[PDB]
Amino acid sequence: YRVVVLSFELLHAPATVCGPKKSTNLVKNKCVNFNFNGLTGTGVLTESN
Amino acid sequence: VNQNAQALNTLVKQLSSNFGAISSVLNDILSRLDPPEAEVQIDRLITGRL
């Protein structure tokens, strides 16, 4: 039997491999459901100082 | 005021602790595991946080 082990680094860094989901244009100044490369959350998106 | 604030800050810090789950972040487990088995991970956090 041929065997493969798919090891993943789930430790945080910028995105380098990703599953087949399409991206979309980003909303600001409104409450939105949001994801960045698996960083799923819910809230208002705004420019940082 | 110091005792009130240290107890509040500890209640907040214990959101980050693992209690023996595969992540402490609930939304990690909700992305990475299917419901039939994710519930065995999340119970650790519900019990730990409670």
Helix content bin of chain A? under 10%
How does the helix and strand content of chain A classify structurally?
mainly beta
| Biggest interface found | A-B, 3 and 3 residues
Rg calculated over all Cα atoms of chain A: 16 Å
The major sheet of chain A is characterized as:
2 strands, antiparallel
Reading the helices and strands of chain A in chain order gives EE
Order of strands in the sheet with most strands of chain A: 1-2
Measured between the Cα atoms of the first and last residue of chain A, the distance is 56 Å
Mass-distribution shape of chain A? elongated
PDB class: viral protein/hydrolase
Keywords: viral protein, VIRAL PROTEIN-HYDROLASE complex
Entry title: SARS-CoV-2 Spike Glycoprotein with one ACE2 Bound
Chains A, B: Spike glycoprotein
Summary, kept brief:
Chain A: Residues 12-34 are annotated as: Disordered. The structure is cut from a larger assembly and holds two copies of chain A. Chain A is an all-beta fold.
Give your account of this protein's structure.
The relative contact order of chain A is 0.23. Chain A is mostly beta strands and 49 residues long. In chain A, a hairpin with a 6-residue loop joins strand 1 and strand 2. In chain A, strands 1-2 form a two-stranded antiparallel ribbon. Chain A contains no helices and two strands. At the A-B interface, loops of A face helix 2 of B. Chain B: This is Spike protein S2'.
